[PDB]
Structure formats: structure tokens, C-alpha cells
Design a protein around this motif. Structure first.
Motif, PDB file in Angstrom:
ATOM      1  N   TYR B   7    -113.007  14.980 -11.022  1.00  0.00           N
ATOM      2  CA  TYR B   7    -112.443  16.327 -10.972  1.00  0.00           C
ATOM      3  C   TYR B   7    -113.067  17.153  -9.849  1.00  0.00           C
ATOM      4  N   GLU B   8    -114.401  17.183  -9.791  1.00  0.00           N
ATOM      5  CA  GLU B   8    -115.070  17.976  -8.768  1.00  0.00           C
ATOM      6  C   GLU B   8    -114.892  17.382  -7.378  1.00  0.00           C
ATOM      7  N   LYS B   9    -114.861  16.051  -7.268  1.00  0.00           N
ATOM      8  CA  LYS B   9    -114.597  15.430  -5.977  1.00  0.00           C
ATOM      9  C   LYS B   9    -113.207  15.781  -5.472  1.00  0.00           C
ATOM     10  N   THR B  10    -112.216  15.793  -6.367  1.00  0.00           N
ATOM     11  CA  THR B  10    -110.870  16.196  -5.981  1.00  0.00           C
ATOM     12  C   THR B  10    -110.837  17.651  -5.538  1.00  0.00           C
ATOM     13  N   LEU B  11    -111.589  18.518  -6.220  1.00  0.00           N
ATOM     14  CA  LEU B  11    -111.657  19.916  -5.795  1.00  0.00           C
ATOM     15  C   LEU B  11    -112.258  20.054  -4.400  1.00  0.00           C
ATOM     16  N   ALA B  12    -113.329  19.308  -4.121  1.00  0.00           N
ATOM     17  CA  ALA B  12    -113.957  19.372  -2.803  1.00  0.00           C
ATOM     18  C   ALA B  12    -113.028  18.847  -1.715  1.00  0.00           C
ATOM     19  N   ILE B  13    -112.324  17.750  -2.002  1.00  0.00           N
ATOM     20  CA  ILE B  13    -111.377  17.182  -1.049  1.00  0.00           C
ATOM     21  C   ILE B  13    -110.250  18.166  -0.764  1.00  0.00           C
ATOM     22  N   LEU B  14    -109.741  18.822  -1.809  1.00  0.00           N
ATOM     23  CA  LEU B  14    -108.676  19.799  -1.624  1.00  0.00           C
ATOM     24  C   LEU B  14    -109.146  20.988  -0.803  1.00  0.00           C
ATOM     25  N   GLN B  15    -110.382  21.444  -1.026  1.00  0.00           N
ATOM     26  CA  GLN B  15    -110.906  22.552  -0.230  1.00  0.00           C
ATOM     27  C   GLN B  15    -111.024  22.173   1.240  1.00  0.00           C
ATOM     28  N   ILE B  16    -111.503  20.955   1.516  1.00  0.00           N
ATOM     29  CA  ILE B  16    -111.633  20.491   2.899  1.00  0.00           C
ATOM     30  C   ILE B  16    -110.268  20.421   3.573  1.00  0.00           C
ATOM     31  N   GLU B  17    -109.277  19.859   2.874  1.00  0.00           N
ATOM     32  CA  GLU B  17    -107.950  19.719   3.466  1.00  0.00           C
ATOM     33  C   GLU B  17    -107.278  21.072   3.674  1.00  0.00           C
ATOM     34  N   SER B  18    -107.466  22.006   2.739  1.00  0.00           N
ATOM     35  CA  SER B  18    -106.881  23.334   2.890  1.00  0.00           C
ATOM     36  C   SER B  18    -107.494  24.082   4.066  1.00  0.00           C
ATOM     37  N   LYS B  20    -108.844  22.676   6.702  1.00  0.00           N
ATOM     38  CA  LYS B  20    -108.369  22.012   7.912  1.00  0.00           C
ATOM     39  C   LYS B  20    -106.950  22.440   8.269  1.00  0.00           C
ATOM     40  N   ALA B  21    -106.076  22.575   7.269  1.00  0.00           N
ATOM     41  CA  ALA B  21    -104.711  23.028   7.531  1.00  0.00           C
ATOM     42  C   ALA B  21    -104.685  24.459   8.059  1.00  0.00           C
ATOM     43  N   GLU B  22    -105.501  25.336   7.465  1.00  0.00           N
ATOM     44  CA  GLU B  22    -105.595  26.711   7.945  1.00  0.00           C
ATOM     45  C   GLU B  22    -106.083  26.759   9.386  1.00  0.00           C
ATOM     46  N   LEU B  23    -107.095  25.950   9.714  1.00  0.00           N
ATOM     47  CA  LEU B  23    -107.612  25.932  11.076  1.00  0.00           C
ATOM     48  C   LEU B  23    -106.607  25.359  12.064  1.00  0.00           C
ATOM     49  N   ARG B  24    -105.804  24.376  11.652  1.00  0.00           N
ATOM     50  CA  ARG B  24    -104.782  23.843  12.548  1.00  0.00           C
ATOM     51  C   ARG B  24    -103.710  24.880  12.856  1.00  0.00           C
ATOM     52  N   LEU B  25    -103.271  25.627  11.837  1.00  0.00           N
ATOM     53  CA  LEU B  25    -102.300  26.691  12.084  1.00  0.00           C
ATOM     54  C   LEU B  25    -102.888  27.786  12.969  1.00  0.00           C
TER      55      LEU B  25
END
Lengths: 57, 63
Positions: B7-18, B20-25
Motif C-alpha cells: 500500500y505505502e509503496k504504491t502511494l510513493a510510486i503514485l506520488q513520484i509519477e504525479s 513527474k507528470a506535473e514537471l513534464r507539463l
């Protein structure tokens, strides 16, 4: 753009030398040594202020 | 290990991907604005150099 300002014939009138180039070159060295202050003042104003319309005096 | 680790690993992965998407935009918008009006470090197209202009007095006074 703007209107270019330039002096009139009255302020461009002067007592011209009316002296040929050969007599000028014959007297060139003593003329260049007699009043070099006035000539260098004119050249200094002419090279500082690039406008010929402010060195007429 | 248990469900909390995944659960916590999925939360960390989602935070990293979000992030990264914000920085790409943000990168896309920044690049577009800079090329539209070059005022940042990027898209600085060159210009003839100041250091090769001769400022010495010339032979002609009107320069």
C-alpha cells in the motif's frame, strides 16, 4: 520623423581665404605651427561632436 | 510482509509519477513561452559581438 535643423546662409557666410592649393602647401608648415591651437580646437569639437552644425564658430 | 508495505509503496510510486507528470507539463509550457518570447536562458539566438567594433577615432569625423 523629425525635421532636420540646419543653419542659414547668414550664419554660413564667412570671409573665405580664396587661396590656391599650391600657395596653401607652400605655407602649410608655418600655418600648421602658428595657430595649431585654433585648428586643434576645431578638430577636437569636430571629432567629439559629430554634427558639423555645432562647430561653425 | 503484509498489505501495508505494498500500500505505502504504491502511494510513493503514485506520488513520484504525479510529480513527474506535473514537471513534464511545466517543461512544455516553459519551453513554449521562452521560444514565443525569448527572455529566459533558453532559445537565446546569437547576435554580432560588441568586442569587434572599432571605437577608435576614424579618418572621417562623422562616424
Amino acid at each position: 520623423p523629425g525635421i532636420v535643423e540646419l543653419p542659414t546662409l547668414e550664419e554660413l557666410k564667412v570671409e573665405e581665404v580664396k587661396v590656391s592649393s599650391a600657395v596653401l602647401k607652400a605655407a602649410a608648415h608655418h600655418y600648421g605651427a602658428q595657430c595649431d591651437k585654433t585648428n586643434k580646437e576645431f578638430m577636437l569639437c569636430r571629432w567629439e561632436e559629430k554634427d558639423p552644425r555645432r562647430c561653425l564658430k | 510482509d503484509g498489505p501495508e508495505k505494498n500500500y505505502e509503496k504504491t502511494l510513493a510510486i503514485l506520488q513520484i509519477e504525479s510529480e513527474k507528470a506535473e514537471l513534464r507539463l511545466k517543461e512544455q509550457e516553459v519551453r513554449r513561452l521562452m521560444r514565443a518570447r525569448g527572455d529566459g536562458p533558453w532559445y537565446q539566438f546569437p547576435t554580432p559581438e560588441k568586442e569587434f567594433i572599432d571605437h577608435s577615432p576614424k579618418a572621417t569625423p562623422d562616424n
